[PDB]
């Protein structure tokens, strides 16, 4: 089994992982307490490589939902999904915590529910006989999800360090600063852990998110409850090599390893094209495969903020372009030929880059049976642009004298302020030294 145990943590990290499971139930066509169709084995050929294997003809996800506020998990028992999950082997109903908005609460709460936090992942791993890893779906948004998630990057990198560590971080909207004020602190605190307590991550941003939500989803005002729709689908899109047949890189640690050349450059930008429902009327005339990877190499679907004058002094190094559903697997070699003549992907000025192309067959569902799907998993060397945005609001904040002694009460009593600042400066420099 290539069972990955998801570590959903956080007020926002729970919800984006919640519709990740409901999506899998909508396309496998299942009841959340019974397997009522033959689409479970005809549609999908593995259904328990991320789920606990059938012993009642039913599938139980390999997810744990622990959080300081029991209120996000109490909203799972008002939906028919609290018998898809179980009452202690997924989540403990009424597991309290802090206030919680402090990072230093959640960091100390992993150090005293320390016994139970590594029994819940191993209660829910009694059929993993060869573990993939642990993916921490933990949000930076809120002090709840960033505090307890930063603890678990450390204890799972000292017992399972060669196994996958990979987080879906979402840095809260950096154009508010009177909604969240602890925002440069909780970001730089997890960012220290991504580079020496972790292998690879897949970063995201909220302020580059909502750009797309009004351009391809076309909502009237960004609010978190549509943001979770767009995230929950790219999480089921990235595992379509491991839940359906394949061979070359048919593991989730097969895809992600080949997007790393050097530590401190492994931050993957995510892009996903079929969010528009006006491409299902342009498939009666055929949407082609030639141009569906000419909008993946275009920067339009970018969920990580960055300049359009920082891609002329930087080039992409590794870019993976995943088609699902229709593809036509004889003209996919016709699709890559025209890439080099336009040059929509930049190539590193010290050797050839890499365009890895993949295809995968899927279960019947609407962007994998009527219309083309493109997942991008980019690797660009302009990723220091978020780190400069968070580090210039962190030292500015220290110039307003905020959280230098209103943060030293609970388990910070040394100078660790310059520890986040400098380790961020090693990252901002080492990327530029290895990129001309």
């Amino acid at each position: 089994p290539r069972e990955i145990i998801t570590l959903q943590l956080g007020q926002c990290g729970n919800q984006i992982g919640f519709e990740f499971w409901k999506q899998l139930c909508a396309e496998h066509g299942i009841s959340p307490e019974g397997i009522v169709e033959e689409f479970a084995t005809e549609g999908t050929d593995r259904k328990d490589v991320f789920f606990y294997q059938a012993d009642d003809e039913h599938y139980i996800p390999r997810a744990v939902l622990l959080d300081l506020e029991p209120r996000v998990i109490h909203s799972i028992l008002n939906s028919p999904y609290a018998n898809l999950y179980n009452p202690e082997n997924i989540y403990l109903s009424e597991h309290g915590g802090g206030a919680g908005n402090n990072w230093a609460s959640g960091f100390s709460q992993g150090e005293k529910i320390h016994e139970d936090i590594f029994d819940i992942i191993d209660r829910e791993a009694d059929g993993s006989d060869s573990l993939e890893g642990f993916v921490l779906c933990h949000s930076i948004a809120g002090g709840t999800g960033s505090g307890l998630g930063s603890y678990l990057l450390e204890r799972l990198n000292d017992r399972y360090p060669k196994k996958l560590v990979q987080t879906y971080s979402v840095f809260p909207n950096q154009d508010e600063m009177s909604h969240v004020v602890v925002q440069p602190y909780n970001s730089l605190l997890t960012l220290k852990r991504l580079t020496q307590n972790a292998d690879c991550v897949v970063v995201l941003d909220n302020t580059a998110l909502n750009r797309i939500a009004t351009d391809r989803l076309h909502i009237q005002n960004p609010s978190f409850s549509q943001i979770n729709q767009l995230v929950s689908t790219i999480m089921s899109a990235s595992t379509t090599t491991l839940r359906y047949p394949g061979y070359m890189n048919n593991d989730l640690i097969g895809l992600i390893a080949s997007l790393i050349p050097t530590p401190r450059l492994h931050f993957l930008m995510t892009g996903y094209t079929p969010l528009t429902t006006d491409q299902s009327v342009a498939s009666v005339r055929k949407t082609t495969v030639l141009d569906v990877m000419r909008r993946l190499l275009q920067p339009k679907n970018v969920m990580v903020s960055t300049g359009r004058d920082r891609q002329t002094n930087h080039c992409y190094i590794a870019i993976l372009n995943i088609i699902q559903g229709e593809v036509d697997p004889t003209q996919v070699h016709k699709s890559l030929q025209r890439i080099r003549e336009r040059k929509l992907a930049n190539f590193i000025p010290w050797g050839p880059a890499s365009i890895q192309v993949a295809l995968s067959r899927k279960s019947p569902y609407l962007p994998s049976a009527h219309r083309v799907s493109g997942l991008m998993m980019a690797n660009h060397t302009n990723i220091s642009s978020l780190f400069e945005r968070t580090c210039r609001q962190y030292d500015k904040l220290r110039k307003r004298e905020a959280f230098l002694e209103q943060f030293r009460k609970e388990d910070i009593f040394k100078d660790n302020f310059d520890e986040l600042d400098n380790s961020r400066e090693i990252v901002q420099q080492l990327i530029d030294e290895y990129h001309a």
Binding site: R2, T41, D45, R46, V49, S130, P161, K162, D199, L242, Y244, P245, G246, Y247, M248, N249, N250, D251, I253, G254, A257, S258, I260, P261, T262, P263, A318, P329, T330, V332, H333, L336, Q337, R340, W350, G351, P352, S354, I355, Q356, V357, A358, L359, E433, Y434
Partner: protein, 287 residues
């Protein structure tokens, strides 16, 4: 074709031996492989026949497909015939499938004997690709000095070469042949035309995989690059000290020198006709 489709399920048998040793299957042959491959990585005897016959028993029970769980019980492909020369030549797996009559007239031994040697060349690049895959995932084999950043300049040049040669070349040679082959089954009238489009199936597969049953420059192109990966991985499966890392970037300057040398033979092979090697030559431009 009415008794050869329902009485005996011929075409299901055709994709079934293709799931075995053309690698068309899912994580069936993948999870067979990595227990064996973790024993290779520490150079401990992996042959050890016995556990391997239980590893393909465990293979066909992954995905739960129900066209090879049913073949493990009766019409067994559980039996794997191993070749361990004392000449001293590497291990080589021979899988054979016991096929029903009168389907065994279409699939003779001479067929399975060439499906052996294409599985023999797919698995060998599975050993060079996943060695380069997993070591990148391992996050160094040793974790003056500080020669790693200058090393990471010429690693991902050969990590990406090997991977794309088995990723983008492979997926066209399994799909185009298999899709035009499924056509000639849909047309099929009678058995004598079926035996012929399968005899033309291997011949397509021959000309696809590696060209020739003799000297070509593309077999040289595999085994030269293979001697790169053997020298790379055996050194990186061991702790390295201060000045050892200095021989890695010294070896790797020579390794990229021999990589360029076999691209430039392969252009001579692309002007003497049209081949898949035109796609092979384009593959090396992308890497």
């Amino acid at each position: 074709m009415y008794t050869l489709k329902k009485d005996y399920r011929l075409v299901e048998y055709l994709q079934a031996m293709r799931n075995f040793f053309l690698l068309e299957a899912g994580d069936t042959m993948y999870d067979f492989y990595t227990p064996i491959f973790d024993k290779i990585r520490e150079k401990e005897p992996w042959l050890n026949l016995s556990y391997l016959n239980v590893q393909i028993q465990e293979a066909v029970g992954q995905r739960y497909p129900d066209d090879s769980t049913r073949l493990s019980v009766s019409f067994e492909s559980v039996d794997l015939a191993k070749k361990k020369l004392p000449v001293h030549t590497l291990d080589g797996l021979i899988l054979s499938y016991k096929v029903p009559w009168p389907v065994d007239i279409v699939i003779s031994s001479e067929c399975q004997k060439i499906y052996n040697q294409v599985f023999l060349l797919l698995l060998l690049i599975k050993w060079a690709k996943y060695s380069l895959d997993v070591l990148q995932f391992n996050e160094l084999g040793n974790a003056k000095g500080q020669q790693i950043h200058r090393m990471f300049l010429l690693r991902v040049k050969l990590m990406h070469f090997v991977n794309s040669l088995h990723n983008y070349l492979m997926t066209r040679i399994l799909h185009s042949t298999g899709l035009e082959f499924q056509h000639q089954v849909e047309e099929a009238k009678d058995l004598d035309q079926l035996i012929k489009i399968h005899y033309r199936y291997l011949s397509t597969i021959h000309d696809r995989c590696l060209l020739r049953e003799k000297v070509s420059s593309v077999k040289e192109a595999i085994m030269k690059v293979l001697n790169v990966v053997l020298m790379f991985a055996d050194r990186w499966h061991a702790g390295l000290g201060a000045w050892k890392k200095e021989s890695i970037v010294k070896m790797e300057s020579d390794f990229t020198n021999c990589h360029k040398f076999l691209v430039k033979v392969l252009n001579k092979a692309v002007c003497r006709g049209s081949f898949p090697h035109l796609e092979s030559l384009a593959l090396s431009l992308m890497a």
